[PDB]
Design a protein around this ligand. Sequence first.
Ligand SMILES: CCCCCCCC/C=C\CCCCCCCC(=O)O
Length: 309
Amino acid sequence: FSPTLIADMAKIFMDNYCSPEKLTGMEEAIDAASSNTEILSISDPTMLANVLTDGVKKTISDSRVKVTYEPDLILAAPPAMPDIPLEHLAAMIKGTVKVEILEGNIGYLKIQHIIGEEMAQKVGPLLLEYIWDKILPTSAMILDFRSTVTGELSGIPYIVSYFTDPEPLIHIDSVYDRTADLTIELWSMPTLLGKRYGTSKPLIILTSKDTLGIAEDVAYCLKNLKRATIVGENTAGGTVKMSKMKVGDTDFYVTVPVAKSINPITGKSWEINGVAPDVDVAAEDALDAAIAIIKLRAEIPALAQAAAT
Ligand SMILES: CCCCCCCC/C=C\CCCCCCCC(=O)O
């Protein structure tokens, strides 16, 4: 063990935590913890991990930060792979989406995985006809994120851009990564492969309590941009990036949020609390409600013109 252990955990935490400005008093609690003889009296490594974990809680107020003792932890490395041609990547993407026109000429696109910039640029031309051209002529659009739990940050501009004006460029999100000490800015793209959907047609996004990750960010941003109505349940409240980090040559690990979104409109984030629906309904009922909203609103102009004269 040693007191060295505490010092080395602390450095990993301090060097990587996404919000260093909130760490007043931390260096001091580290010093105290290193000389706390009750801590020094712990021989059980799992008890040591639990104690340090609760100690940081009563110091930092962030429930995502944890120390664990994990002997026998092996992380599954990415699998070995031959060349995968673009046509087979396109077939894999087809398997993660459901594209449909629902009665009423309403576009439906269920997206299980938000694809990243590389994939979108390289395989997108192979999917234009299959996904996008099918739903382009619809009068309204429903994006179904109710079961979306994975995705890439770099895909966000590709979704938002199709639903917004080319000009002015929109600053969609700003993400800070503490480990890289870098801010990543996400902007709309004035030129796209496909045609824009326009700004007039209704866009509704369906959400569930399971909706997690980049999908929460897409919905949050389109909501704050006043482009989309959110229908369903409050989303899960994920984190842009967690890292689980080994402490030296020891079996202790520090788990820390290392990146965060700082929304250009709200100043806040989708993270932790998730995104609140505009129309709150059970997730199983979200699709029916979205359809009903779109249908009613489309009826309004004709109603008005009959009443006016
Ligand atoms: C993520 C690793 C950071 C290192 C942790 C430093 C934070 C301070 C740790 C513990 C505070 C001490 C509180 C518990 C005292 C033990 C007394 C008791 O359990 O009865």
